[PDB]
Amino acid sequence: AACTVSNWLAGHESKPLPNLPKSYRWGLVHWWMGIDHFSFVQFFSNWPRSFHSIIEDEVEFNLEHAVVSTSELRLKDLLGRLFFGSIRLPERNLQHNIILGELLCYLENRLWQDKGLIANLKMNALEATVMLNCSLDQIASMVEQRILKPNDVTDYLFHFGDIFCLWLAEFQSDEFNRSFYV
RNA sequence: CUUAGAAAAGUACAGCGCGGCUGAAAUCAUCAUUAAAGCGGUUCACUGCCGCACAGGCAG
């Protein structure tokens, strides 16, 4: 079924595929090379379980083989690759970016589990701007207003749960919207 | 390119004898330091066993 992707990239039919716009299709395969053969088609077959399972295996590898500590971990150590990678994709539309939609679904639905290990990850100011689509001066403005509460230009002073909730509260857009992915 | 050119002041030495600063005194009255204040563990060192132990040892 490796030849089916040629029809899929053309932009019609392709029932086992989500028929995204051709630009996003290309971006999706751009993601896929890093993580061109027949393995592409059946990954999207039984897609929710498959994606959740690969996220399970990556998170379990990073947690079990963690080197820093059980707590005080950083995003890159635990989720950096999968997150920081898939995020910067064309347009960033949540609905069209199926990978980011499902990643945010999983992250939000597993926030505060166990001892809130995912909701207390230390994050630096740079990745906060990357995942919020915000300026450094604006970040300084909000931290001056105490919208952001540190626990510096580049320091690990924020938390993943706080930043995610700030995105949900103040950084939702017409196309970067939660309702398009729930 | 120096009032340029050059130059050994060195040998000895006993300051010694004696001494009463003494008389007198009052420092001395009064006094309001007062007002106002978060230093903050979110989990983290738990639960069993032995021994008589406010003794001391076991494990997960």
From TrEMBL:
<protein>
    <submittedName>
        <fullName>TniQ</fullName>
    </submittedName>
</protein>
